[PDB]
Amino acid sequence: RNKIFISHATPDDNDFTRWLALKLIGLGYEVWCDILFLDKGVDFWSNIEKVIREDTCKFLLVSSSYSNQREGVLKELAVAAKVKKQLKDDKFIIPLAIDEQLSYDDINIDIVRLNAIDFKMSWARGLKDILEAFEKQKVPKEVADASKSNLLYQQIFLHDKSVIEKEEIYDSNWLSILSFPEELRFHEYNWMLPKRFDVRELTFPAVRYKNYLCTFAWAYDFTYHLPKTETYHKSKTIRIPTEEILSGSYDSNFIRNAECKRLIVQLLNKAFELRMKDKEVQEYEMSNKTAYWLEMLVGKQKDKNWHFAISGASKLYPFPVLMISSHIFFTADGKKLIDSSSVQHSSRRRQGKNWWNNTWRTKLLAFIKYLSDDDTSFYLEMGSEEKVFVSNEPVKFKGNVSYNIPE
């Protein structure tokens, strides 16, 4: 006889029973409990009686408002009383009172006359009382060990949940850039274009640089805004292919490689802005960037409709991509933004509360797929006969470790 039998209510006293059973197993005792076993079933009955009758040395009972008048507990108490009579041991059953709502005058007749251990005001002194009682009654025990307790804990709540070797695929918010024009060209309108022309309003993306014009466009493009351009000798156009400056294998006193990359990024950003203007999508000037949204991608929240929105920035590191962000914006009637940034912050904080992974990714891919041009790509028009082609499916990543999502 080495076991110490703990009786309790299975779904109600689980916390205290687990705590006490693991503490006792750490101290070095041997414990039998129905929360210490997996793969149960026909085990109930025909095995509880055997362990109570032939293995148990002490019968700890957890006394609470739930264990009072419970059939299994009462039957186990009856068997324990018969066993106590069978042996010469009056201190075979030790009630433990924990429920402040169980008055000591409302105890079942089986244990009304027994001396219990109090746990209500604190559990540490109750544990000390149990330990002292066991030492005084010479209950069997081995050398104290708690590594054993940790190992056992693992066998149950760590196997049912750990990481698993499982191949999965993810979606990201990056869109790869597919096409680049062949040769960026600089048109020398040496003191031919007006000095304060504000070249940001032209028909194609342009960027002033020295007395030149940095653009992907064609020599006599944008003639409406610059009338005096037909008389222009085309041989004075300094032509540099895009691949060489992208790979970093170009540098000269006229322009460095980093500067070329920066101007290319500027051109890409302006082209994206102009195209989104072409797409006829609403704007939203954020603190430093601009967002876009549609007048499910639109829905309701009490008196305010929520609008999924995106913002896009183009980068050349790690690889040429167009990174996307996700936002929510709110309107009084689906057409006019509320002119209150604090209200927008509060609404966006309380609306993304219930949006999980799938919601975010599905809405993002729905919005991006809506901008697709024909079948699988989306082009940014850099000139009359120049385009930059961008993908409509985000980049995938692969991994070999995952979890089992055990509900």
């Binding site: 540490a124 708690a146 949940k161 990481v163 990201s172 790690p318 995938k396 990543f397 991994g399 995952s402």
Partner: protein, 469 residues
């Protein structure tokens, strides 16, 4: 297709040489390293504040539960966990009359009233420390909500004292530095939250489901601030030193005059864990620039190397300077002009402003935590926030962001850098959490920097973290 890699959990250490991945589980199973005997507390506050603190102490002597025992381990009582006594009988009271508090919180000037209130409290604390017999391990400052509402720098009210920060907490902690008195600041609505309600009959802050989490946090902070060691790292290698750097702006002066503070961490060689601030604030006169002049860089690195040598007896075999910024060539040349010949100096940059988000294609649960994407031999992304299968939940609510780690200078192995950055997320003694989202070398250095930037009179400050956090 791009390939990801996984990094295993670092594990932490507890009493009896037992390792675990969680601090709550390992504290409930095994217990802390050292043996305290009991916490004797000094409580300065109003009468109702004293009653509130007493009631809270009477509340954490018993088990306290959360709503879910898997997502959040429960609290089995202070003495069950920490094997020491912290009870509401070893308390000394220093009354603060409410009339004074009302008097000083009206001057229509944030700086002046903040200075007056901090003076009010620290006067009593200092007098009690100097001229009395009772011994106090930690001082608990109970603060009404009206004081907390109007003392923020951007707080509206519906010269001599202007050389101080307009924040009560930082000024209070800085003006007590030259006395070295550990203290814990509590709001009145934090210990008795059920009583403070909004105009609907419900608590403003609802802790009903996370009471055990609050008990864990408060108990761990009180235990650590009284000289307790809750846990330590289990696989720190020998001869490696970790050095954090963070910049703050000394506002409220003619010169913004950026300042720099560092935090240090290495192995004791007694199998301990030396983790203390390394700070004498170093300055850069030029505005907007976050780089050290050669003199300051030489001084900082020399001091850190000398501290390591004195503790250990030899110079380090490797120094990792974690930072939130890049280094320039003057900075690193100054750094390299004092480092010993046979030492390796690596400068890492940890950045958070880099858009990238991975979405699982099927479920409503985010990416696994310890995943990483290696762009290049000198760069890689790292997910320190994400799903943790142990607790059947994630450390965030929306899709988490990764950290962009870059080996800016030196020559190292990026995989080992990621492995070391992930383990440093397991030392937030200022909280009781599963794991942090940022290395603690860059967080406690920031806390120190924001503490000793609210005053100008501080000289040779203390380095033990219990006087700042």
């Amino acid at each position: 297709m791009k390939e990801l890699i996984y990094i295993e959990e670092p594990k932490i250490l507890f009493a009896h040489g037992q390792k675990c991945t969680d601090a709550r589980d390992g504290l409930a199973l095994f217990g802390p390293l050292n043996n305290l005997y009991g916490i004797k507390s000094g409580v300065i506050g109003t009468k109702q504040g004293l009653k509130i603190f007493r009631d809270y102490l009477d509340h954490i002597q018993k088990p306290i539960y959360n709503s879910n025992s898997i997502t959040r381990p429960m609290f089995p009582g202070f003495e069950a966990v920490f094997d020491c006594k912290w009870e509401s009988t070893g308390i000394t009271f220093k009354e603060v009359t409410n009339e004074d508090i009302g008097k000083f919180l009206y001057n229509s000037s944030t700086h002046k009233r903040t200075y007056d209130l901090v003076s009010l409290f620290i006067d009593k604390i200092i007098s009690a420390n100097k001229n009395e017999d009772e011994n106090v391990d930690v001082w608990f400052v109970i603060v009404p909500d009206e004081i907390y509402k109007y003392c923020r720098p951007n707080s509206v009210l519906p010269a001599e004292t202007y050389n101080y920060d307009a924040q009560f907490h930082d000024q209070f902690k800085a003006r007590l530095l030259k006395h070295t008195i550990p203290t814990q600041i509590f709001r009145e609505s934090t210990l008795a939250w059920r009583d403070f309600k909004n105009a609907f009959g419900l608590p403003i802050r609802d802790f009903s489901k996370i009471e055990g989490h609050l008990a864990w946090t408060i108990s761990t902070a009180a235990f650590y601030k009284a000289g307790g060691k809750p846990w330590k790292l289990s696989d720190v290698r020998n001869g490696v030193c970790y050095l954090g750097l963070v910049y703050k702006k000394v506002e409220k002066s003619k010169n913004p005059r950026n300042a720099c503070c560092a935090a240090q961490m290495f192995l004791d060689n007694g199998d301990g864990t030396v983790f203390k601030g390394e700070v004498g604030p170093w300055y850069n006169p030029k505005n907007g620039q976050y780089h050290l002049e050669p003199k300051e860089a030489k001084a900082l690195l020399s001091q850190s190397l000398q501290s390591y040598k004195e503790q250990i007896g030899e110079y380090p075999k490797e120094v990792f300077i974690h930072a939130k910024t890049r280094f320039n060539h003057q900075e690193w040349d100054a750094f390299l002009e004092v480092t010993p010949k046979e030492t390796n100096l690596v400068g890492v940059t940890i950045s958070k402003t880099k858009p990238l988000k991975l979405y699982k294609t099927e479920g409503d649960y985010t990416i696994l935590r310890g995943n990483a994407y290696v762009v290049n031999e000198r760069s890689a992304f790292l997910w320190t926030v994400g799903y943790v299968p142990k607790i059947q939940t994630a450390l965030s609510m929306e899709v988490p962001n990764p950290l962009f780690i870059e080996i800016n200078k030196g020559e190292a192995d990026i995989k080992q850098v990621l492995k070391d950055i992930l383990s440093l997320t397991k030392l937030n003694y200022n909280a009781c959490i599963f794991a942090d989202g940022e290395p603690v070398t860059l967080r406690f250095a920031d806390k120190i920097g924001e503490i000793l930037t609210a005053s100008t009179d501080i000289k040779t400050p203390p380095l033990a973290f219990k006087y700042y956090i």
